[PDB]
Amino acid sequence: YGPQTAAGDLVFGVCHIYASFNDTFVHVTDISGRETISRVTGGMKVKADRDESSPYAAMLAAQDVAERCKECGITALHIKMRATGGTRSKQPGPGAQSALRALARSGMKIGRIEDVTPIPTDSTRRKGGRRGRRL
RNA sequence: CACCCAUCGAUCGUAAGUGAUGGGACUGUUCGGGGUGAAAGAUACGGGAGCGCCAGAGGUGAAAUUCUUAGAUCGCUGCCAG
């Protein structure tokens, strides 16, 4: 099933792409965000714990979410990319460009593109003491 | 310009320095995350409610302890606290 509109129109959902260093969410929802349509993570497409953030897992996840959002009736995506943000890291993880390419090549039209990494006007004490994650 | 009358007071008088690119005080005037009192704000971390969705999420060199179909993580809008 799907929505009904005139011939020359595009149904726009919003695709939140959560690209942290440990996983990768691809999350297609209604423009409100209130109604999830389909979300797939990089950990649903691989066996190893490592590959949850691999560029291949994010590709397969954004694929398998694009096919289902087409099944539902969504044709274009306003894209909202996100890193862990807050205090962790404002740099988007590896499986972000691969999710973008997956959606674009798969066939979803791409509207706006955005960065919604949570950032602080000022922040709570970051994890790891004064000396940080000594390695 | 030493005086002239109109019309306002008419205290009795400085004579032992000068006023440091010394100091202090004053006036004016910036300037500044200087101090302190009281409201308001901002996202973010966390929890919580409502609404979706379903199989993982978190974490790592790799894992595991940890959370999770009894609905975790994720998404949206209020809410609470620091």
Side-chain angles (χ1 to χ4, degrees), chain A residues 45-117:
Chain A
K45 303 286 99 176
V46 293
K47 273 212 182 169
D49 294 19
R50 312 166 276 199
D51 313 340
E52 299 172 353
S53 65
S54 173
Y56 201 63
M59 200 203 66
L60 311 175
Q63 279 173 2
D64 297 21
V65 81
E67 280 96 12
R68 188 150 170 85
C69 71
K70 291 173 196 181
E71 179 178 1
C72 293
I74 302 283
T75 310
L77 293 163
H78 294 299
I79 287 175
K80 290 199 175 308
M81 323 201 57
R82 157 166 284 170
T84 318
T87 62
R88 296 310 306 149
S89 69
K90 272 74 72 178
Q91 183 177 1
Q97 316 302 295
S98 64
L100 282 193
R101 269 194 89 241
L103 298 175
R105 306 281 321 292
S106 179
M108 304 297 298
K109 297 286 98 175
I110 294 191
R112 307 293 157 187
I113 291 170
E114 184 65 26
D115 196 62
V116 175
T117 68

